[PDB]
Amino acid sequence: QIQHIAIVGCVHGKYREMYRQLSEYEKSTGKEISFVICTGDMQTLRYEADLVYLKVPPKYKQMGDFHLYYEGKEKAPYLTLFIGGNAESSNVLLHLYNGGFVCFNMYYLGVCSCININGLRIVGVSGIYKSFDEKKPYTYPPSPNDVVSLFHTRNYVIQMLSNLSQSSQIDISLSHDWPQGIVMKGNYKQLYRFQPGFKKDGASLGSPINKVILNTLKPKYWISGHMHCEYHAEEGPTHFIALGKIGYKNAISYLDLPLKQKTDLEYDKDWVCNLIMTWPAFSNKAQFPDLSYSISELLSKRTKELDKKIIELWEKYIGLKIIYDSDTFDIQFTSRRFYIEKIYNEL
Ligand SMILES: [Fe+2]
Ligand SMILES: [Zn+2]
Structure with a gap:
């Protein structure tokens, strides 16, 4: 009893090319794809006005394929779970910072979260690291002035995820940029022949936030992208897998689990x-x-009997199943926070 999981690197708005390759593979090999995992740079632009929030050079200010899926004229053939990168419709992903479906079969994992599927636990960490913004809060509603900073990984996600490995094991973990130092744990002399630019950064290459999360959350696999190249490394048990950009046939690999x-x-x-x-x-x-609160010790108030009754209210008001919701993303922002507040205020 085996499931075939498609892992995808950078998409950069070339959705039809990605699904064309995925559909070719499963009818090539006869294997069935359970679901698809993407490592960011999705460019989920709904309409032309969303181009304002896409932090890219002028030569890449393009809509992409996503608007076809949002408009419903294309349908994603596989359930696709993804995180955010640096080339994103940052306004959309801020509305869905607690996760949400941007369209049918395309679920955004939020700023960070953990999900369940086929008995697996999958953790996602969105964005890329920039030191001068790691302690900067989000401002809502999204403003065009924040296009340069919305996709930066915040430090607080370290404390939001640190306890996830206590009850059971994390199977798969997602980041966009690599965990800092993971370059030192594979065939880097071959990787430097692919790109001698990465030799400048050396061991400091990658996100230090993802390094702390990788060492803490223990995962069996860690898949990343951003670098537009193939790479595999091993730090302890964690099979590190880096993927390339869609368009080059090094972007999509497969986890037979x-x-x-x-x-x-x-x-x-x-x-x-x-x-x-x-x-x-x-x-x-x-x-x-509000970082005047301590996220780490706010979590210390969790107990076994309090956890089990949070679930009941969640199952009542929201439900354990992650289902597709076609409400506008600003409405989903209010709705999800509305029930998060209602559940909290009942304890
Ligand atoms: Fe990227
Ligand atoms: Zn990329």
Whole structure:
């Protein structure tokens, strides 16, 4: 009983090319793709006005294929879970910072979260690291002035995810830029022959935020992109897999993993409790998170019997199944926070 998971690097708005390759493979090899995982740079632009939030050089200010899927004239043939990179419709991803479907079969994991599917636990970390913005809060609603800073990974995601490895093991973890120092743990002399530019950065290459998360959350696999190249490294058990950009046939690999039980996409219980217990830090919708609160010790108020009754209210008001919701992304922002607040205020 085996599931075939398609892992994809940078998409850069070339969705039809990606699904064309995925559809070719499963009818090539006869294998069936369970779901697809993307490592960011999705460019989920709905309409021309969203081009303002895409931080790219002028030669890449393009719509891409996503608007066809948002308009419904194209349909993603596989369930696609993805995180955010640096070339994103940052306004859209800020509305869905708690996750959400940008269209049918395309689920955004949020700023960071953990999900359940087919007995696996999958963690995502969006954005790329820039030191001068790691402690900077988000401002809502999204403004065109924040195009340069919205896609930067915030430091607080380290404390939002640190406890996820306590109850069980993390199977797959996602980041866009590489975990800092992971370049030192594979065939780097061959990688430097691909790009001698990476030799300048050396061991300091990558995100230090993802390095802390990688060493803490223990995962079996860590898949990243951003670098537009293939690379595999090993640090402890973690099979590090870097993928390239769509258009080059080094972007899509496949994880042939054991299938415990075919199970629908669901919210991770431990993450749901972390999300509720941290609501005081996110209570101000205009600016979050309020780092005057301690995210690490807000989570210390979790107990076994309190966790199990957060789940009941979540299953009542939201549901354990992650289902498609076609409401506008600004409405989904208010709705998800509305029930997060309601669940918290009932404990
Ligand atoms: Fe990137
Ligand atoms: Zn890229």
